[PDB]
Design a binder for this molecule. Structure first.
Ligand SMILES: [Mg+2]
Length: 376
């Protein structure tokens, strides 16, 4: 199994114990590290943060401490939107300019591949032709990577993609059978499946549906989404299940109604480190849990929730990570990906569960820190 760990280049700005940079990553926890995010200007890949060049070097230097480790650079993300991708895929000239720039950039800085995180082809302003043009891009990139490996006599750069977990976005965005042939791995965003924007409490990454859910609400769970990808053409071994190391917060409209589906008035309060209303890192969650919150196991969905007065949290913990890891092995998927390693209790000082408690849970469950043949 693989364990793919996203690192974000804005975690460094968080105050105090929240600041996280590549040298804080345990090089043995994951099989692959993915750097989020690069940008694009005039159809060429580029940096975004002022010190990305320095961070790229520290990130790829982690491979000097783990000979099995591979790194990828992710391009795009939610804030980046779709317009640069639409322009880039619109012509063969622009796709070639982009692919050439990617090979050069990955080799320049020491990355082993590119993770495409276009959110999403065919949505958020992207026109309908982008569904097929995304396939064309990926095919052309895979072929260019295959050719560069032979010409340079080196292991091939990998092409992966982070892909939607919502059924409407999946159907508008992806030609699953052909796309899956050319991607090396498919990183499915099986999280953000509920949130305060819906007006009621719900879980971030529930494994199964809640018993009341019918119609399209019955699709909002990890099991349905991963099986949708598999059943519509993606091989199980290329499918990577998304695991969030964060939770979503809500304000309860009625504090006496604190189960699933309780009406809410908006996002919960921003945490002091991540400073984003509606979102808490796992280490911020532990502070909440230890400050008088009531924790409930949502047995139908195999995830915890917690509440305190009018604050409600849908999240994941060691138990839910363990349950979902057991399930992914039972279903022969390729592994797990975490959003994001900088949200784990990397110092160990918030949760009293050791360093990197959520990431370590997946490393142990998926046999990541193991060997087969004796070696030098
Ligand atoms: Mg964030």
């Amino acid at each position: 199994y693989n364990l793919i760990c996203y690192f974000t280049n804005w975690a460094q700005y968080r105050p105090g114990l929240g600041s996280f940079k590549p040298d804080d990553i345990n090089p043995c926890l994951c099989t692959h590290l993915i750097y989020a995010f690069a940008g694009m200007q005039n159809n060429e890949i580029t940096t975004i943060e002022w010190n990305d060049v320095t961070l790229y070097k520290a990130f790829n230097d982690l491979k000097n401490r783990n000979s099995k480790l591979k790194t990828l650079l992710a391009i795009g993300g939610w804030n980046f939107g779709t317009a640069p991708f639409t322009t880039m895929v619109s012509t063969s000239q622009n796709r070639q300019t982009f692919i050439t720039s990617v090979i050069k950039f990955l080799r320049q800085y020491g990355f082993d591949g590119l993770d495409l995180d276009w959110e999403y082809p065919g949505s958020r302003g992207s026109p309908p032709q982008d569904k097929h043009l995304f396939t064309v891009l990926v095919k052309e990139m895979r072929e260019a990577f295959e050719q560069e490996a032979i010409e340079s006599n080196r292991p091939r750069l990998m092409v992966t993609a982070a892909v939607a977990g919502g059924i409407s976005n999946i159907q508008a965005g992806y030609e699953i059978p052909e796309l899956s042939k050319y991607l090396d791995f498919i990183h499915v965003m099986t999280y953000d499946l509920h949130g305060s924007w819906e007006g009621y409490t719900g879980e971030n990454s529930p494994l199964y549906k809640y018993p009341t859910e019918t119609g399209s609400n019955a699709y909002l769970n990890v099991d349905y989404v991963m099986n949708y990808w598999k059943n519509n053409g993606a091989p199980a071994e290329k499918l990577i299940v998304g695991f969030p190391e964060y939770g979503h917060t809500f304000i309860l409209r009625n504090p006496s109604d604190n189960g699933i589906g309780a009406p809410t008035s908006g996002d919960g309060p921003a945490g002091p480190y991540t400073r984003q209303a509606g979102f808490w890192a796992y280490y911020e969650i532990c502070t909440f849990l230890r400050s008088g919150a009531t924790e409930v196991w949502d047995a139908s969905q195999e995830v915890p929730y917690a509440y305190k007065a009018n604050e409600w949290l849908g999240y994941d913990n060691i138990k839910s990570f363990s349950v979902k890891a057991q399930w992914l092995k039972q279903n022969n998927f390729g592994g797990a990906m975490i959003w994001a390693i900088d949200l784990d209790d990397f110092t160990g000082s918030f949760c009293d569960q050791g360093k990197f408690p959520l990431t370590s849970t997946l490393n142990k469950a998926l046999g990541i820190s193991t060997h087969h043949h004796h070696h030098h």
